[PDB]
Amino acid sequence: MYVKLISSDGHEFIVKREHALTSGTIKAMLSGNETNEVNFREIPSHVLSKVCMYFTYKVRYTNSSTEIPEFPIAPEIALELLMAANFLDC
Amino acid sequence: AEKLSPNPPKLTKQMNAIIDTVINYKDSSGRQLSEVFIQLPSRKELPEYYELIRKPVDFKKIKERIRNHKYRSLGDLEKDVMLLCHNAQTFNLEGSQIYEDSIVLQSVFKSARQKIAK
Amino acid sequence: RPVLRSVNSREPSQVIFCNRSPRVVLPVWLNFDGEPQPYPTLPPGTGRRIHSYRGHLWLFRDAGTHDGLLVNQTELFVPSLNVDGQPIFANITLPVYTLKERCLQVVRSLVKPENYRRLDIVRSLYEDLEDHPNVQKDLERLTQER
Amino acid sequence: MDVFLMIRRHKTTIFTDAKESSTVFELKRIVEGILKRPPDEQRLYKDDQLLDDGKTLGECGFTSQTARPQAPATVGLAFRADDTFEALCIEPFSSPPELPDVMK
Ligand SMILES: Cc1ncsc1-c1ccc(CNC(=O)[C@@H]2C[C@@H](O)CN2C(=O)[C@@H](NC(=O)C2(F)CC2)C(C)(C)C)c(OCCc2ccc(CN3CCN(c4cc(-c5ccccc5O)nnc4N)CC3)cc2)c1
């Protein structure tokens, strides 16, 4: 139900499983009997926290009848978030 | 074969007062209803217009025929302005703003023309 | 005659374009030859009653970046014939972009394409930034779907 | 009205959601399911002010406005073990590097 995602500096991010499965890389790491924890030695705290925020944003607003808001990305994290997203396939 | 002589200046002055009222007309929203009708699209832009609309004319050509005395009376001028408006109406059909703009430009023409100070 | 095109059906249809997104929306009408025609833009939160015709394809992009947007949760919009006197509503919203695409959008908005290759990222991402969103690429994919 | 929170303690961060009419006790039940500590054993905070069992997240300031899926609001979590009360401590996330001059 809930899976743990550790950053490179040790921060623990607990999210729903259906939320973390938004990432393709995380989906392979999980259940590959099945796994509940994933560690990333090359993604910092300020990136995973924003990554996990996207998981909440994707699952809530996918197939929604609401007004979809913009996902905000500050300039100072855009690069690191880009390869984080490229690495996680989400 | 004296078709060379120009229209009397009072007649040309009259036609240009009417066609300027029509072209400069703005609705209560400040919008120039005549702008889309100043110049026709090219045959390569909109071939469907020339397939269907068969005697094409724009305000550019209408106000041209005033300079060169092609219209010999205010009625000759009205015949093209009505043909311009009916061309837009049969191509775009009711329910379109261009149709309803041409409804109004017809009304402005007959108000502007019915101003005869004579 | 392309498969994604408007049909020259002279059947009027009233449509309400409603930009329910934070973006400046560029409506793109598909020609009778399937060629994209840009139409006047819509500020965020703005709506307009639009006259169109039955069987005409519509498409909606970000006016500044050409990012793809959604209309009634789909990518394409075709107005039916109006039932009685009732306009067809086109709700234009953002899509749920991938995390990678949203990042590309923001990096594209800050890094001018000259300095794409000056960014110290995996070189497979340089080419991702260069894959700018446009209408023809979407028409290609959306066509081959059918 | 869905509210989206980010329950943080030391270097643990829990992503979860509730409704604006959900109660602080009802978060404490969600936290109990995840961290196995009953409501009496936990203290919830909203920027140093102790949160209140029996109060709705809206009355605590958590609304659809301030706690958005893409920008959740932070709730501080502290544990009580019998007679011991640890202080509320939330370790900061890492800082981003400075912008490459390419952008600025
Ligand atoms: C407010 C606003 N906000 C955000 S978007 C927007 C908005 C939305 C719609 C319109 C106007 N509506 C349309 O163009 C609809 C939409 C699509 O279904 C196709 N279509 C059509 O009329 C086609 N017509 C047909 O299919 C038929 F009629 C056969 C059935 C077409 C394009 C003419 C082939 C608009 O309008 C303002 C923007 C806008 C849109 C298009 C154009 C370019 N045009 C093209 C040709 N046009 C015409 C000129 C004359 C004409 C000219 C001179 C003299 C006499 C004449 O009769 N007659 N008919 C014309 N269609 C001039 C300008 C310019 C400006 C603004």
Author numbering:
A (entry chain B): 17 to 48, 55 to 112
B (entry chain G): 1373 to 1490
C (entry chain C): 60 to 205
D (entry chain A): 1 to 104
What do the authors of the reporting publication say about this deposited model?
Targeted protein degradation via “hijacking” of the ubiquitin-proteasome system using proteolysis targeting chimeras (PROTACs) has evolved into a novel therapeutic modality. Inducing proximity between a target protein and a ubiquitin ligase complex can promote the transfer of ubiquitin to the target and subsequent degradation through the 26 S proteasome. PROTACs are constructed from two ligands that are connected by a linker.
To verify the modeled ternary structure, we compared top models with published crystal structures for three different PROTAC systems including an in-house ternary crystal structure of compound 11 (PROTAC 2).
